[PDB]
Design an enzyme around this catalytic site. Structure first.
Site, short mmCIF file in Angstrom:
data_model
loop_
_atom_site.label_atom_id
_atom_site.label_comp_id
_atom_site.label_asym_id
_atom_site.label_seq_id
_atom_site.Cartn_x
_atom_site.Cartn_y
_atom_site.Cartn_z
N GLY A 64 -37.35 -5.29 22.42
CA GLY A 64 -37.31 -6.75 22.62
C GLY A 64 -37.42 -7.53 21.30
N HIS A 121 -25.41 -6.34 19.40
CA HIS A 121 -25.77 -5.27 20.36
C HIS A 121 -26.47 -5.88 21.58
CE1 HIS A 121 -29.82 -4.35 18.19
NE2 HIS A 121 -30.13 -4.67 19.45
N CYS A 130 -35.59 -7.19 18.50
CA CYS A 130 -34.29 -7.38 17.82
C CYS A 130 -33.97 -8.89 17.79
CB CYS A 130 -33.21 -6.51 18.45
SG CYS A 130 -33.53 -4.73 18.21
#
Lengths: 304, 304
Positions: free
Chosen positions: A143, A41, A145
């Site tokens: 931020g 993603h 991830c």
């Protein structure tokens, strides 16, 4: 003495964290040998996230569109592929700090350390469990991830988790390092509800053993029970069923304390039915379920 | 979202841990530049510990009697001195992994990370607070002495604690890095009792703010209070007095949530008087006091 919620030392993982940017999205990657692993993603706008077709989005991306930064030095991306829900970015430099490592898929109830990162920079380390509904209760801001979960066996880091998603209920979902989600979750901004977050019974028992070892004994009763009797009470309190496999796993703690596993079950049964009555066990007012029997042996024995 | 008891990433401190052996005693040292810091009780037998005269014991010790090992390589000891309750071993090699660092003496209520070590090898990392009675509630087995507590500000490690002692009640005492004990404790195996372990009120309030930020709001009430009124209830519940300094420190959290500090005091007052009634706040059944307002801002903002 003393018993603490304890993470693995994070240094070996700190040395693997990088920043990955694709257009306007920045998150964290894991650099092992000449591969950077990150959530796929990274290629999505928040608009994309509502209904992303990753294969179609990815056609629009070249190696030079993935910006990988390790400290303040840029890595050269020489290839990229999608495996399930992760991207693998081949870089032209092997991470010189690559520790011995494995990718492992953990089972519900298994605990691990999370190194929470922002822009490839470690901010903290905490201990989690894979919940029986395959969520984790983390601490993850925008931020975070690509932050990873790991266990260490002497000098080998087993990576078990990469952070992808917050559910609308503010619990966390992610993948193993081959990009397979834990549980039924998908990397899409949609209605995704967790199932019942049951208590990890074998972990509570392990922690009750840790308590006895450390002098907190007030809850030890004169009763015993059977797996079937205990399990009827467990069901009622949204505790996971206890199996003979779990009893076997608790054997060493049984042996060290001389408290039969089924006796400790009967203590746990009374705690469920009667509550703590304003008392604490190892400084907690609830039954802690994020220590495995292995965690308790490790911390009670001093493994490094 | 999510809020976790979070330690600093431990890598910078992992790189400073060594093994110190004097005769039959092995414990941990901290290697910064060309100095190794360790508890002076490294020179004691368990017999010595009952009534040690450190100056007299130390006359019997030469540089070659201190065996310092970093990984599996021996450091050459070229001098030694006692400062308060620590030994400083001058070695002929500056630690190449020395981070930017400070020695700081923390105040009661201040939180820090502990890197629990055995034989110079990191086993785990957890978050502590200096208790108002100057104890810590750690996890320390035999061999853990010389394990250190630290905070990190970007790339500077502030070392605030070195582990020396377990009290007969299984709480922990140690020194700053100039070897001065926190509280009235001494490095002698004798009757030493902790005072009242009061709750760190300003930390509970900070954590109540963290709860509101993360969606746990059930405890917010329609009441306010004054410092004097609140403090009368605080005294009764063995909570530390709240000062205007504490109110000032909570200002940013006040601002972010729009909940006046004194309103949150009145919420905390009702929680003390009425209990949790079997409810949890951020997954705890008790009021957590080992997050500082700075900790809460850090974790809620994502500092690295």
């Amino acid at each position: 003495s003393g018993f603490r919620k304890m993470a693995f030392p994070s240094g070996k993982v700190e040395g693997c964290m990088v920043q990955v940017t694709c257009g306007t999205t920045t998150l964290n990657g894991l650099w092992l040998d000449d591969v950077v692993y990150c959530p796929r993603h990274v290629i999505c706008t928040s608009e994309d996230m509502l209904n992303p077709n990753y294969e179609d989005l990815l056609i629009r991306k070249s190696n030079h569109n993935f910006l990988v930064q390790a400290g303040n030095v840029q890595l050269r991306v020489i290839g990229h592929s999608m495996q399930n829900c992760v991207l693998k970015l081949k870089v032209d430099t092997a991470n010189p700090k690559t520790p011995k490592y494995k990718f492992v898929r953990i089972q519900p109830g298994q605990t691990f350390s999370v190194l929470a990162c922002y822009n490839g920079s470690p901010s903290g380390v905490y201990q989690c469990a894979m919940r029986p509904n395959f969520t984790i209760k983390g601490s993850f801001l925008n931020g975070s991830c690509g932050s990873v979960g790991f266990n260490i066996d002497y000098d080998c880091v087993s990576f078990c988790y990469m952070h992808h998603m917050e559910l609308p209920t503010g619990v966390h979902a992610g993948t193993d390092l081959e990009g397979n989600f834990y549980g039924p979750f998908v990397d899409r901004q949609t209605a995704q509800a967790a199932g019942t977050d049951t208590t990890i019974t074998v972990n509570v028992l392990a922690w009750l053993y840790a308590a006895v070892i450390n002098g907190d004994r007030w809850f030890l009763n004169r009763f015993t029970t059977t797996l079937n009797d205990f399990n009827l009470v467990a069901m009622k309190y949204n505790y996971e069923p206890l199996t003979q496999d779990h009893v076997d796993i608790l054997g060493p703690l049984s042996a060290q304390t001389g408290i039969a596993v089924l006796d400790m079950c009967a203590s746990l049964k009374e705690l469920l039915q009667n509550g703590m009555n304003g008392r604490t066990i190892l400084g907690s007012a609830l039954l802690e379920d994020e220590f495995t029997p292995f965690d308790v042996v490790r911390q009670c024995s001093g493994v490094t």
